[PDB]
Design a protein around this nucleic acid. Structure first.
Length: 93
RNA sequence: GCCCGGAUAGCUCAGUCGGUAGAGCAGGGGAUUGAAAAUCCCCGUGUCCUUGGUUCGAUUCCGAGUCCGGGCACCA
RNA sequence: GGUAGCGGGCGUGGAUCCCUGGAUGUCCGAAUGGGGGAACCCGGCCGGCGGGAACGCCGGUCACCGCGCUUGCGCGGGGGGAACCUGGGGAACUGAAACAUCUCAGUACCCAGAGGAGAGGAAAGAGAAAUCGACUCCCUGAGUAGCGGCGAGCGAAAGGGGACCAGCCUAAACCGUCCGGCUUGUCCGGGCGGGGUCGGGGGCCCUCGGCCGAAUCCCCAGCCUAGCCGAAGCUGUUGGGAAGCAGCGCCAGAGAGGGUGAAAGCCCCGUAGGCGAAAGGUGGGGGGAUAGGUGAGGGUACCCGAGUACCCCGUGGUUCGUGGAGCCAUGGGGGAAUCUGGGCGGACCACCGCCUAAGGCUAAGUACUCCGGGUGACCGAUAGCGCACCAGUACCGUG
RNA sequence: GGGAAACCGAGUCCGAACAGGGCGCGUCCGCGGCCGUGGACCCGAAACCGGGCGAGCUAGCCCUGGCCAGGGUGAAGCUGGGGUGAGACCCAGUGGAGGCCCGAACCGGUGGGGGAUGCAAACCCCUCGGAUGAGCUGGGGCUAGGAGUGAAAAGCUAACCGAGCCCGGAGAUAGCUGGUUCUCCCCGAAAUGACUUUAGGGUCAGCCUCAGGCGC
RNA sequence: GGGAUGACCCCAGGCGGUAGGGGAGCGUUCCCGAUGCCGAUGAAGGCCGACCCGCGAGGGCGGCUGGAGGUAAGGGAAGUGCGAAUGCCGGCAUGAGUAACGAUAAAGAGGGUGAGAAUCCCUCUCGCCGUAAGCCCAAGGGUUCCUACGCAAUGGUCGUCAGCGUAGGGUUAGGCGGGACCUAAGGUGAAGCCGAAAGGCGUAGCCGAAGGGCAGCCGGUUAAUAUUCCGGCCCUUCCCGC
RNA sequence: CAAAUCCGCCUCCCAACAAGCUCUGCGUGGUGGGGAAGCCCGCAACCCCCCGAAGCCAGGGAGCCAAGAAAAGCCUCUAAGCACAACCUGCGGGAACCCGUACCGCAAACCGACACAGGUGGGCGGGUGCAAGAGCACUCAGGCGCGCGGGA
RNA sequence: CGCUUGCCCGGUGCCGGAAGGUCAAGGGGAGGGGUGCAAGCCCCGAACCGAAGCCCCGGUGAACGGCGGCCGUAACUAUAACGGUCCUAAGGUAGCGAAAUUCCUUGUCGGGUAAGUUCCGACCUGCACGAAAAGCGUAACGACCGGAGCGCUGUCUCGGCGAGGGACCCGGUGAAAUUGAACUGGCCGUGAAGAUGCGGCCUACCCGUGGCAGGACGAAAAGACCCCGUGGAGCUUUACUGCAGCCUGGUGUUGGCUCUUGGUCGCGCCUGCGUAGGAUAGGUGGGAGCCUGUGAACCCCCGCCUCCGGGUGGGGGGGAGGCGCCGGUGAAAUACCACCCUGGCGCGGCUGGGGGCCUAACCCUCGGAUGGGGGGACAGCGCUUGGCGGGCAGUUUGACUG
RNA sequence: UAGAAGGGGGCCUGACUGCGAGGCCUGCAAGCCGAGCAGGGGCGAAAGCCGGGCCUAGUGAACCGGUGGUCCCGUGUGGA
């Protein structure tokens, strides 16, 4: 699934199996014994964090963890209550 | 093809951190006992592969040649 | 209405009939009060009807999600569409005279989204020209340059001819205000407003002020949705019938065509030519109005889009299949600078040049044909659409 | 025009070479024959892949109901009697157990005959297996295509399953088999060789034909 | 060879033919020729001929049929010629008056009716079923129920008959069965979790029945309905008032 | 998942293969209906014995191991509330909606292209005889002779 | 159910082994190269450290599996209790045996029959039984397969008669596969080698109805069998290549405090005893002076190293003296000062391994918690490295060929 | 084939570079024989002979790579 901050989501990539010797060394070069489709995923993770009274957690790529703690800070100038951890986040840019 | 180890007594192997060439086994002479062994004394044996060079000389230290032994790859 | 028949009616006091606007429109269906085996059952609240409290009708109103403004109130969305379009996923038969890389192919297909189109789009561009100057589309370039078990095969771009013609708004410094935090400070950060948009510009300090103009609104012309006017021939004869044949005439901006008992410019409907809208659509094509935008110096060096550029690992796009492998995109790890900044010109270094990434919009030229009209060295009932006829019907299948 | 190219040019390339030697004197449209790419003369597979439709037939399990005439055998346990120091134990009576027995309904299919353009795309007659259980059965549910289910045959999954049906890719491919439509005139073959994952298929040579030229 | 090239006369040779190569023609559809030409005193198409012209494919001529179209000379395009494909569509033949007429429970006579009766109606004999071949419900079917007129077809024969044709009748509920009650497997699904899209899970809730809950018995009437209509006896809920 | 006078746990007066209060079945019951075989369509009893369920009283009893649905209606306990409400027991008068109901239904009307010798769940299924029975033979009620026939 | 289930861990599998060999990314960088005028910027790259797997050492049978040959010998002959020799991981035990296993085979004896390739009992030269793909047995059970008797019969010698439903004749209704056209005979021959159809001869007036199956190479199904096609599809494995899954090193999510050790670069101290020689000489260069109130000679208290000869560092006292050249020996000589690792200690940076304890990420739990317990930087997950991998997929497995 | 191709010695390296008229063989592509000119050599006094071996088998197209050289190309220019 997808990063709530960065918008990164799984992609398709190939998997190329080669044998043989680099041309760059010894020679003749490499042959592709096979190729298959497969997918790469974003290293994502949970970040739980304070903000107001409620708990509110984010499921974000590891590479943007910081950007959450940054968002917490710059929502210090903002009126936040209402039994709605759900709307805090929604109202959280 | 590329990177490691090695050659020393008949066999199998230990060495000065440059100045000594040494073990075990086998073979041989004797001690021995009912037989065969196991004890125990005693000796034989060298171009240290190899040609060069460092050096006061070198088995050791370094260029190089040679063969035996490993290790990892490529093959149109 | 497709009219025949009973059995009744209407109309120059202008009917039937055609165009435009409105009214009414059960039940199902995205289906939305709730339920459900689609067209059926069952409710709440407010009002109405019956003698009407129990019963039953009638009208109004009650789904969920997303955005905004004091929990209510406002805007929106949902589904369908012959092709045509963009994005996310994405085969195999086959070809290679076997097959595995390669090919068929980013094809068939699935999914989401857009609209009368869609996509793209104003240079971190092309590439070698003392060069060009957004994007799309056609003709060349060219089966060229290249890619390739260098096999089978795949296959660019620049440049030249045309079509169309258009350019714009923000982020950031700096300034003002409203609100809510803190360690109550000339402070931190949030919403508006102002400033500001570039191949060098902008901000801040000090000395000089004028046209360009909508893609937004308004008005017209024209056009679509009913219709109207239209020239000129008689007789005889053969014949079931004249439009044939014969005598004597006439029109033509009209001798396209169809019809009439056979074969007709002048009998009928038309054709050439010319007319017409109260109402609804359309509409810079032609006129008007705003919104918006236009200079120069000299100094400070405060700002120019960040987990980004950049390097490394894994992949995709391109003619490029690891190759000397750049450029453009990016899942993972590390990780800057603000113009003495940064990317590109096919590893790399140095010279010489090109361009300003990390926010957005933007007509026209192009695509398709459910729909209407025009044509045909197209078919003429085993043809042509599957259907000229009551056909996606009868009939076949659980579907 | 030569050359891989730099390049040179009526020449140019290998070469030291005024040796030798290799290559070096029209276009446009119409018409007709043949070739390449596209189904490319027409009909035909067994199969492969994609998206859907099927558990109202059949297989398993889940929820809730229903059904099994009448006979037969007689487990344990009770109660009494006996036995012993106490007991084990042994008798009678009672009692009604069980993937027990006979046999309908009901579930099944063992042997033989009939049927064989059938009454019937699995039937009929005689005979036979089970029948309180690992039992049969109605209604409501769930699992699917390299997947389900299976007391296990590769069985079943809507009258043909060693991988269902429908539509599409699609006019797959088919070195194989079949078929190919009016008339007259002139000429008229081959069934050999070489190579071929080749051997009933091909490529070159050979043998048929037409046009132009040459002329014993 | 003539050679007044005449495509006509004279002379001399060649002419079996599969795969194939080459050369000439004939016919089918459509276009120019066309605002023309033929045509009811008869177009196209159809049927006949012993006649005329062509080597032949073909083309003329004549007679009958047909009733509104046809289209030269000279040229141009192509869906252009069938006997075979276990070819495709349709029509009609052969087997042939042949095998069959769907349980071996079984028939006979007399009266009706009618154009017409082995096959319809009535009566009397005979035979077959009777944990059925009888009666009552559930599913599924969808007017087949009842009546009046009928018999072309459907019926394995016949048909005056019918589950057939035309037309009109006929299904009545507080208490029977479902729904304005309940929950079962399972399904759906607030909160909530997951997945490239499509979508997959899931607490409470909701749907879901032949299981739980729940008030009707005995008689009579129709051509065709009956715990539904009618009669006697016996019940259940709501609402208002005392 | 204390809110209870209800449940559940202790403790002690009475009371116990009972009585008492309940709730079903069958019997009877005011009275209402029905009512053969027989002639051309028609006279109005209803009593006594015997066999007897697999049905009823039903949540009955015993034995056994494999240890045998949920929820509402229905009783009771209290919450907020409310006590001029509100329930409960009689008695009177009102009110009581939607859908199905013909016919075939082991079959010629359903599944099998057919008026097909096949397939199809629940209840009733009389009498006599053969040991029993839903078995077998005949037979009640009721229904049929199977939509081609005649001769040899 | 009963009685039992022997021997072989060479090879395959699985289980155990903190050593050792091989080993990918990664760490590390001796040294090389391209370019710049250079600062630099760019490529390659050797030692060494570096997982799972593999090698290696062991275990393991109700784990895959396996369980011998040739010659000789007893006072008749026959045969061998005994013996020799080769091979193996080990050489088949008990029990059964011409068998659902036996080729030779109808083995040979016996039983049953008048006669018995079958059947039952025996014997073994078991082509080719054998212990949990169990061995030898076993009351009761069986629409299972074999061999026998008794009873009874149309099964048969060997057929007969009879019944009903069809077959046949008449009235009504009326199909089918098949079909080049047909005026459709025998024998010998002939022919693409099995003739109604050609040749010669022989037979035979025209047309039907009930019967039979020898022929029309009769009908039906574009042969399963055999080939053939560089045709298809299901199954297998130590066939090829991949993929799901599982294992594993480095990273990220990932943090505190200790102890213990590696490798590297700094520096600061040591380190060295052949023969001779004052005495324990590392090299090479410098070198005529150095040391002491920056308290020297001598003694005692005390650490470390040793070739046991000595070398060297501290503390306390004490007082004014110490060394080299020269000399002499040796290849090389001395005091003092330099760069230099031959090996070692001490603080340093720089990364890198193992042990513990913590709690605060992550995960599990607790009468529902802004909290308490438990695990804990491990586990899970992202990217990446190498391995195992018929559990799954695509395919290849030649031609000639009397 | 001894009128040496056989046996023995001396000096050598033509087991050359650049070409090659003309033919054998032949579907293709391959295989074979080769006089002669230029250059620089060996043996011989010279004539001359030598472009491996008495002769006919001892072999493998293209593709992809390795090493050593050289006139060539070198993605704006120099170099890589």
């Amino acid at each position: 699934k997808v990063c709530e901050i960065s918008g990164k989501r799984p992609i398709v990539a190939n998997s190329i199996q080669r044998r043989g010797k680099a041309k760059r060394e010894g020679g003749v070069g490499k042959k592709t014994t096979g190729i298959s489709k497969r997918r790469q995923y974003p290293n994502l993770q949970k970040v739980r964090v304070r903000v107001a009274g409620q708990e509110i957690t984010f499921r974000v790529a590891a590479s943007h963890i910081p950007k959450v703690y940054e968002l917490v800070e710059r929502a210090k100038g903002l009126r936040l209550e209402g039994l709605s951890p759900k709307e805090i986040k929604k109202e959280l840019l």
